[PDB]
Curated annotation (Swiss-Prot):
GO terms for cellular component: ATP-binding cassette (ABC) transporter complex, substrate-binding subunit-containing; membrane; outer membrane-bounded periplasmic space; periplasmic space. Keywords: Nickel, Periplasm, Signal, Transport. The keyword Transport applies. It is found in: Periplasm. Belongs to the bacterial solute-binding protein 5 family. It comes from the Bacteria. Involved in a nickel transport system, probably represents the nickel binder. This is Nickel-binding periplasmic protein. PANTHER family: NICKEL-BINDING PERIPLASMIC PROTEIN, PERIPLASMIC BINDING COMPONENT OF ABC TRANSPORTER. The keyword Transport applies. Its main location: periplasm. Transmembrane segments: none annotated. GO terms for biological process: negative chemotaxis; nickel cation import across plasma membrane; nickel cation transport; peptide transport. It comes from Escherichia coli (strain K12).
Length: 498
């Protein structure tokens, strides 16, 4: 067993290098590795590996007082030296962390003693603590497990301070974690967690039905949503659906015809029946999104005006912009050129494909010809990074990333959002303002900057918001109520208490 559970994940957890990205899975990195400060649902951080901290008046020099009772799972001490060596290891790979502005802000990290850790920043970076709280990269592996005094070229054993220890991994089959019996904090009720590698959502559902696994935990892609709804009525099962955690949306390329035209992007934003999309493809399990960030997101309750489903207005917008229908044709033309838009998505993702088909159909109704380009995962991310798309499925990042980190990343050219925004006359101003808002401690100016950035993105119709999606759970009743983590990408296994 009752203290052992079996769950599933679409891939292995990875080697659990704390400082690297794919194929490392964030929830698993967070099981093993811990932050200086821990993110809370109310947006604050609490003391964690750091028990307290102070900062200079200019807000650029921070000194953390670390716990003195923490050991890595291999018995070696966690101290300021170990922490400082981890920051060096991360920043020796600084290029790869360009998306995360703290990685460009940290000027210096040194241990002043065994318990005092000093971090110096370029500027008074206000999201400092929240970005230290992220699953990666600023969490701590035993320096003994560095490879030639680095982590960027790999690690030895994935030795963290956290409540879970990786017991063993087997590529394309499973990962097994056990409870850290020498953990400095609260001991988890569960002693062993086995992750079965099951890439297909239907196969995950079947694995649960057959009893092969005890728990499914994930976003809207966790399992087929009609099946989830059926499960929710099955008295032998337990299901849960969280309050929304992030936005799913289309990104429209402002630098590529015909989505380079504001009037086209505005029309597209009136063309989709989002309610029907969610009821048709998402089995009514998710919420309609009118804005890049839900009004419940920090700094984003701005009274932005929704573009409600209105095919009539979509048509009028296109007509006014010179996109009219030729005799005997359903697809509009302007300067002899058809209103054709390519929508790129992961071809094997049945849910994305379903939504893509609905979007294609809705947009045909107002005279836009959407071509579906379903491709393998690597091809889609290649398109995102280089802007080789007309429209692309996209999502925000959830707490604590939304909105500051998501916005920060819009400045990085090798991301979808920069690429989608590249055609905007105001893109330089937007990027300047994103830089400014992150270093602003004038709360009035901070809100004004966020308002301007988000309003410009909204008014310029860069995105086609579709849904605010939720975390979902399917479980054996004996496991009880399953908690959600403050960080949308973490899974609070240590809080499960049958
Ligand atoms: C579930 O995945 C994420 C959940 C929340 C935020 C992000 C954004 N990531 C930003 C850094 N990405 C690295 C990666 O995910 O491998 C950047 C990036 C590069 C290429 C393609 C995608 C992405 S993240 C959309 C944070 C992270 O991965 O640590 C996620 O990727
Ligand atoms: Cl991945
Ligand atoms: Cl890059
Ligand atoms: Cl400017
Ligand atoms: Fe990422």
């Amino acid at each position: 067993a009752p203290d052992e559970i079996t769950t599933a994940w679409p891939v292995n957890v990875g080697p659990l290098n704390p400082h690297l990205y794919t194929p490392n899975q964030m929830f698993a990195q967070s099981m093993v590795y811990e932050p200086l400060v821990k993110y809370q649902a109310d947006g604050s951080v609490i003391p964690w590996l750091a028990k307290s901290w102070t900062h200079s008046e200019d807000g650029k020099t921070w000194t953390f007082t670390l716990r003195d009772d923490v050991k890595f799972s291999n018995g070696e001490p966690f101290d300021a030296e170990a922490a400082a060596e981890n920051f060096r290891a991360v920043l020796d790979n600084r290029q790869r962390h360009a998306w995360l502005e703290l990685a460009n802000q940290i000027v210096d990290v040194k241990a002043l003693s065994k318990t005092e850790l000093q971090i110096t920043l370029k500027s008074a970076y206000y999201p400092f603590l929240q970005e230290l709280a992220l699953p990666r990269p600023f969490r701590f592996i035993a320096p003994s497990q560095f490879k030639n005094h680095e982590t960027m070229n790999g690690i030895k054993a994935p030795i963290g301070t956290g409540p879970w220890i990786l017991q063993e991994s087997k590529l394309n089959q499973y990962d097994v974690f056990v409870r850290n019996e020498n953990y400095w904090g609260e001991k988890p009720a569960i002693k062993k967690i086995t992750f079965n590698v099951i890439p297909d959502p239907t196969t995950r559902a079947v694995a649960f039905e057959t009893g092969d696994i005890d728990l499914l935990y994930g976003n809207e892609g966790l399992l087929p949503l009609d099946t989830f709804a059926r499960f929710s009525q099955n008295p032998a099962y337990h299901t849960q659906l969280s309050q929304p955690i992030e936005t799913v949306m289309l990104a429209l390329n402002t630098a590529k015809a015909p989505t380079n035209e504001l009037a086209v992007r505005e029309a597209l934003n009136y063309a989709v029946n989002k309610k029907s999309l969610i009821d048709n493809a998402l089995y009514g399990t998710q919420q309609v999104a009118d804005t890049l960030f839900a009004p419940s997101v920090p700094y984003a309750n701005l009274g932005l005006k929704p573009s409600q489903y209105d095919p009539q207005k979509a048509k009028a917008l296109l007509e006014k912009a010179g996109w009219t229908l030729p005799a005997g044709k359903d697809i509009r033309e302007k300067n002899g050129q058809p209103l054709r838009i390519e929508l790129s998505f992961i071809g094997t993702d049945a849910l994305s494909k379903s939504m893509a088909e609905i979007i294609q159909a809705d947009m045909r109704q107002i005279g836009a010809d959407v071509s579906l380009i379903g491709e393998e995962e690597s091809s889609i991310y290649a398109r995102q990074r280089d802007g080789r798309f007309g429209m692309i499925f996209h999502r925000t990042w959830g707490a604590p990333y939304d909105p500051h980190a998501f916005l920060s990343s819009m400045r990085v050219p090798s991301h979808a959002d920069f690429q989608a925004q590249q055609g905007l006359a105001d893109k330089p101003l937007i990027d300047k303002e994103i830089g400014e808002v992150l270093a602003t401690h004038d709360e009035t100016q901070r809100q004004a900057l966020y308002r301007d950035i988000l309003t410009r993105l909204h008014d310029e119709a860069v995105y086609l918001p579709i849904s605010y999606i939720s975390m979902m759970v399917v479980s054996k009743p004996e496991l009880g109520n399953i908690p959600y983590a403050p960080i949308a990408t973490e899974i609070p296994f240590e809080q499960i208490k049958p």
